[PDB]
Amino acid sequence: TQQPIVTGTSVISMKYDNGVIIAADNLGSYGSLLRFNGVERLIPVGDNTVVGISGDISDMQHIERLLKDLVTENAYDNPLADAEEALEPSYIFEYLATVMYQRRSKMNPLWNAIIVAGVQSNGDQFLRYVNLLGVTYSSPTLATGFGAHMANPLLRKVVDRESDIPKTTVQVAEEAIVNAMRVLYYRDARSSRNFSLAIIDKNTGLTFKKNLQVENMKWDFAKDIKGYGTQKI
Amino acid sequence: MTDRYSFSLTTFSPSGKLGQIDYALTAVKQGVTSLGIKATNGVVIATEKKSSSPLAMSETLSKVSLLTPDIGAVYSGMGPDYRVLVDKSRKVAHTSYKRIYGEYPPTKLLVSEVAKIMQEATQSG
Amino acid sequence: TTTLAFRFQGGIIVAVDSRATAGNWVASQTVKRVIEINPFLLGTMAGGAADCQFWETWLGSQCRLHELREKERISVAAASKILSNLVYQYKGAGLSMGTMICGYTRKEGPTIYYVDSDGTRLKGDIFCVGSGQTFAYGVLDSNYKWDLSVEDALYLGKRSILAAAHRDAYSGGSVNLYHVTEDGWIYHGNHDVGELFWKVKEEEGSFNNVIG
Amino acid sequence: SDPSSINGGIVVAMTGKDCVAIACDLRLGSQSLGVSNKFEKIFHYGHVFLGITGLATDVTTLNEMFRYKTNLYKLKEERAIEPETFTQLVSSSLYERRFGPYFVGPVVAGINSKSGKPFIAGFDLIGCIDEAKDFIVSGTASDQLFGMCESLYEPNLEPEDLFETISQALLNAADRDALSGWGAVVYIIKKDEVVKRYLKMRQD
Amino acid sequence: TTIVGVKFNNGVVIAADTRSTQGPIVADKNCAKLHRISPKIWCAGAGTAADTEAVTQLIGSNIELHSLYTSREPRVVSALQMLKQHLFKYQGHIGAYLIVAGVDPTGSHLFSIHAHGSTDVGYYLSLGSGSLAAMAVLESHWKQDLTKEEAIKLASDAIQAGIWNDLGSGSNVDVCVMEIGKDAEYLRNYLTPNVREEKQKSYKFPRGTTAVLKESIVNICD
Amino acid sequence: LKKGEVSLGASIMAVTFKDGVILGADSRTTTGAYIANRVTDKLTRVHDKIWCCRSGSAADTQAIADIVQYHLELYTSQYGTPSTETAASVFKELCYENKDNLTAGIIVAGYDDKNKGEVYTIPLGGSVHKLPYAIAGSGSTFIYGYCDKNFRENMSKEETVDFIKHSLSQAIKWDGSSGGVIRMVVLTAAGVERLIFYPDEYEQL
Amino acid sequence: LKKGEVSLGASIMAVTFKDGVILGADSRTTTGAYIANRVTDKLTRVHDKIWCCRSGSAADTQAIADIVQYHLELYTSQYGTPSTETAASVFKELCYENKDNLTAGIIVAGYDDKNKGEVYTIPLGGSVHKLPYAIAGSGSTFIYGYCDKNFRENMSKEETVDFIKHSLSQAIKWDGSSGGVIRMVVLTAAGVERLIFYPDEYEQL
Amino acid sequence: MDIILGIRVQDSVILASSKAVTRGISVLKDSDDKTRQLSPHTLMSFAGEAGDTVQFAEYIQANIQLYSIREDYELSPQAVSSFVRQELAKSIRSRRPYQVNVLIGGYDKKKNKPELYQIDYLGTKVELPYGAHGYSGFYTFSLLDHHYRPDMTTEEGLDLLKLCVQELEKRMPMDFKGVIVKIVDKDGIRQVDDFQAQ
Amino acid sequence: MDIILGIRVQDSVILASSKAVTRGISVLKDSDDKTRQLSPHTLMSFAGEAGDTVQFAEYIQANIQLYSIREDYELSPQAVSSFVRQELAKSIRSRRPYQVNVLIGGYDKKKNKPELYQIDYLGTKVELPYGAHGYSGFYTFSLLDHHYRPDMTTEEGLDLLKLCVQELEKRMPMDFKGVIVKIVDKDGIRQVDDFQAQ
Amino acid sequence: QFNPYGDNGGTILGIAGEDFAVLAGDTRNITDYSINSRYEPKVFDCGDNIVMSANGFAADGDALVKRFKNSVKWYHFDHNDKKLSINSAARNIQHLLYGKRFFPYYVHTIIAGLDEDGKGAVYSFDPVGSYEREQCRAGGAAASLIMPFLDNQVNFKNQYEPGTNGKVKKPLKYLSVEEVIKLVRDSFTSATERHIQVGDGLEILIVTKDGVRKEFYELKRD
């Protein structure tokens, strides 16, 4: 029985021919005050998973601690911890989805929406969502909060169905993700211009880009808008 | 102050004549000629533009007016009276018909509405 | 829903309708409202479907256990009280049930106990429960006689349900009848109210205001 | 408390090949109590039919209001109102009470006497018009009717076939609604003739 | 509902979807949300359907009367001020969210009006439950000095974003193009991308299937 | 504020200087967290040299400004050019007398030859306060300190544009309900100048 | 915040600099509009060189600091001097695990020889954020702009005292829930210095 | 709510209406006549909210009595009922709505047939063989549905109402103190003083 | 609530308790006995909430019967009542309180005097000449206060209870379907089968 | 306040044939007006020739299905690999469901398979465990649109023999898997036309003595 205080907005992601990409801005809002500008909401787990989290930040920080523990505890009496018995995206997801649902069933949820993006050991892309209610779903594109409304329509024009995944390159995917992030800075009042993006590819592995900024914005047309109807000057 | 004229200005004279109506008809008699002719596939209404000076721009004074996209009017008599009757007719076409039935009124009914406006000016105070 | 059970010369007549509704939506026209606890005891479902179904099937188990322990058939008084006492433990939690526990034992004779989620346990000769109960009672009260034949009794129960199915929006579908004797209960069929209404009308001459 | 669920009832109209059909059930109830099995919800002003579902006092009031208005119309205009025109009259009449509406769901069905084109329309309680070329459903079993109609309907049926279709759409939709049924009536409407048939159905 | 308005070099285009809903049910699979206020001033409306048709027809009516009185072609700023003062008077109770666009003697215009009475001017606007999906597109592909052809596609694509991604929108796309020197061209069902596949079976019943109790003739004429 | 109506959020201020007065504002309107319009014009003209910055309800402020514009046009036709004090009074009358149904925080700024530049702030209650400069809008809370520290009377145009520009960028920085471009309207004897500053400029200052 | 309990309101901040970190705070507590104590101390010692600025509920923050002081005293007895990051974690554990019943906005500031000065802010939800400086308390809203514009990393003691002195006076100026004297605690290698500034000084800056 | 039942037999309409008036904890009267004669061949029974009930009934009577005099004619039962329905339907969206349910039993001298109309507080009118308001129907309709016949005599109707009242007295929780029964036929309206035991 | 009356005459205690059980819209039973024999010379009648009523009654009976056997003695009525009071006074601040009001009429074979105890759901015990629970007293106390005398015979109490029941049947709104009367005296507990008419 | 429940839309349908049974469900997962996935399977093969779908709040549906599949695993363990019969699976599910009687699994569950005589079987449950064996049952959002249709086309309700004056009911012939699938597809395309939560895809699981077979068809995406 709680209410979120410091919050993170959208986490968007989509899967492409050889991997998945996920991004989330670096803001931690306190209501309408864009309070903290250096919050990383993308959490890499090992070298094959990135968990993006929106929602309550104190709870995200808790989920972070939990993930670091899973890694420590999986290395225990595990000679193959950095190989065959390393944490897979599907393991990290199922674990989180379990916690989320248990917490909702005790009426004390972790006020978050999470997307686990990654690549399985056999090459399969993994992209799955889980939120404060334990609800889970998978799709070629996944976005939380505001991004579900504005990013999905855009990312879906690139990958509308399963067959479209093998026809999409990292270049195309990253371009779409980057554009969605710009649209969100335009229309989401709780967004930040600074963001992070992560690509998990079956060949090149994990590439994590920090300190990205929305660029190439169109604001010039504003010079010609005056009044709200009849004003001429 | 106030319109204390709440009585009729048109009343029956001993011979059964409605004075003001007969005099209004005389005003109409001194007006420019207007006519209308009904054909099988149309109607034509016409009148002369009695411009009261050559410095006036005769086009800025329309004697033939559109009431609805399928109805037109012309007159003979006092121009200003016609002008206000046209405004009222265009309006009633909307208030008593288009805003109710979604279509413009048929000629006879619009005619009937203008006529009522004129009758009341013959009895109201 | 309309369920009834009455006591007479040849046993017990248990009759119920079979409609279930969620708001104005008719969820089923084929609900089983009589739970066959065991071959000798019957229970009627009214109130919460799950509640009745669950606790009465469980009752069926507690009765079996009693018979294994005591080597004697369970009495309707004890059976009903098992249910009733259970229901009372959960009082205030939200269970919803109005049921008749019917049985015919050597020691007691035909016996009907009305048991509800409030904790009430009542022995009686005639009970009707459900949204259509008032209609069923009219018919029941005016034609009930202790000396009814097993054929006329079955009909009365059937007719009473019909009366309720016609007027109560929440009752209808079909009528399920049961005759409870000392050697066990006998099922007397499933009758579609659609077809039954027309038959009763022509044969009996009732429902005159209805055109057909 | 939901005025549109107190009395119960449904109406459906369909268009066919040079015909339309409008049908309704006959129940009038008070919550769970069936009260009348003779409550027709289809009325006609000349050759225009109007079915109305909803709160019964308003259904009765509206029929009376439209009879009044169509009677005066006929006198002034010297001709019977057409379906397209009446539809606009219903809509404007409903929106006039925008903030204290009649709790009804009207449905218009008829054939234009000049052009012969079949016509049906539906409205929400404040007048919004739905001019469909296929079917219109209204009532406490509107979801059910939509389900029935979307599957059973096919364009250009002859009067004899539309009858079966609309009848089945109606009948089966009503049997899944607690507040509908207790009888049904179907009108098959053609340029020249209108046939009215009462259906046999369950009475529970 | 998804409605958009896009301004182009010598005109304006508005478009909308055609699904009408009552809760989760599609009451009308092809309603018209593009209303004519005057020959060259059209308005797209979202919200309460009866309200968007009512407020539009009323102002359109008064605009028609204003034009005949002044002998001038109607202006969008007039429909705009009239619509907004009416909507403000009713404090939001008339649920009309509109995109009013048109051409008049002073040029081409595009404005939006929210139910409470506020207006906005822009080069591209969207409203409706599908507003966000459409705006995501408009924000991705709009550029200044669009041609008529580019604006029709842009506005058309935005509506598609809503049709596909908003459950509150669907069916077809209606467009109305208002170009400075030409007659307004209303393109009803410009795009129809949701045709139902043929049913797997025919449900035509054999005659006699339905049980009839009484049959009789209805007397129409007096 | 009515449930669901468009809000102006805003970071608006009006600052008087040697040559006259400058009005500034952001350009974001919101319905919750959605930015309904990212390029609004909150600087409204009620008379040639009398403008206002609007904050609160978008509908209310438009309605009010539309009526003040009308009252001033009629005033002008009959009695000549109105003073800023008169424009503020008309605004006040409407805001005060209808306090129960409106959410409007309006800053009125204007230029006259006798009075130079003037600023009047009409806060939520309908009270009127004449000040050297005024800030309002939801983003204003964040610049109370900055503005009180940096404002000086009789600054130059260049300096005032800078002050307004820095203040609003901070306001826009912290307030989610503020954003877009920074618009300014300079009112002096010379005339009326419209300025606009884009994100890329103000964001990193 | 429970009905009627004492509130800290406050204008508190912690700023790191070249020699270490400085904590500052006003001294007003209130119950409604009554100033229950006009000379409170919001700078609380949880360890020799690990302090905190408290805001929110007076009861809660005292309870929490009292417990932290204990945890760190026991930690010290067993494992030696605790890092500021450790002191923050303890504060966080308490603030987060009990978020439903507490109202504690705490700023933790401490000095270590290996890490120099450090600042951690624990806002209402119990999340932890490390920063060069932090501001909190009800008065903090009014100086977000001023502080962002004037803070520089690696300032000198003299400069940092001045920055904190100016910011808080502004905060105190605008916030009715802040006032009194300004207290500072300078944490460096040299030791612990307590500074106090009165109204007659800070008010006219 | 009070008990109001009506049954239209072959040559008359019988209205049976309960005799109690209960206010809170005590039964105030046990001889109340919940009926008003609207015209010599039309009777209306009513049940509902405290004062509204009689105020409405007396208003309808006054109005029908006025019509009869102005016109020197007695309106048909159908006409009286439509008038009554319109009045009830007016109050539903009024400042303070009349909460009165009525049964109108009349004998149409012109058609030569008795008629019963049931109209609830909302103006919901329906013509029926038998009817009731409130909960009354819940207990009695099953009996009426079963035993009713259109060619019943007045005595057969009375016997049926008796059975109906017996079921009400057995299963209905409140003591309504019996019913006053009235018959409306070609000769007018008469009160059957024999029902406490017949 | 049901009707529970008790009257203590010279050599006995008479308890009258209504026979109806009403659940919602219908009267389910018209022959209910709202009483339990606690011991051969002690009886308790009860009224209140649906299930709590018989559950509480049978629990008290079970407990008194256990005392009787462990000890081979019958507790005095005064003892039985203090035990019942403490049980009721326990539940009042319980998770879910018993909402049962009882009357205990007993004949004390040691003092050779009849006694009547009235205890409400809160555990409020008072010893009286006559008592009742709920509304019953509102109608009957004016009669008892008037006609009651300490030296009445059993037959005099029965006639007084009859007058009481008549007033209740006249003025009380619900049909409680009559009362079952029981007399407690030196020879035990007997049910007076003659009260429907005496 | 926190609300532990949600509505993920969806519609499922189970129809028992003479020697087969099908359990179909759409593939769309929604939240309010957004589509969460166009392909998120809702009907599952639980082993032992039993198919199940717990439709409603997807988190509870997921949990219940996970618990039942596990019940099947332990039944084998605890009872020497004995095959869990459909009637036994049903009763067992009743207990799972009723186990949460005071904090229900907000789902309408349906399991299909074959009984012990090899005849098709469908069982449907209340969110708290009431269950019955049925002929056909639609569940979820569009249940109200599908059910009346099945009553007419599967159980032949209201249909009579042409010529018999509605006195002889149409004889109850039993449908083949091929005809049932036609009805299922039609039920779904019709529902898709009128319910905004139904669409995207339809996945049908068919069960016969030979095992569980899957079929998938696309549905409109608006």
Ligand SMILES: [Mg+2]
């Ligand atoms: Mg409906």
Ligand SMILES: [Mg+2]
């Ligand atoms: Mg039905």
Ligand SMILES: [Mg+2]
């Ligand atoms: Mg029924």
Ligand SMILES: [Mg+2]
């Ligand atoms: Mg901002």
Ligand SMILES: [Mg+2]
């Ligand atoms: Mg202060």
Ligand SMILES: [Mg+2]
């Ligand atoms: Mg088995």
Ligand SMILES: [Mg+2]
């Ligand atoms: Mg759909």
Ligand SMILES: [Mg+2]
């Ligand atoms: Mg869509």
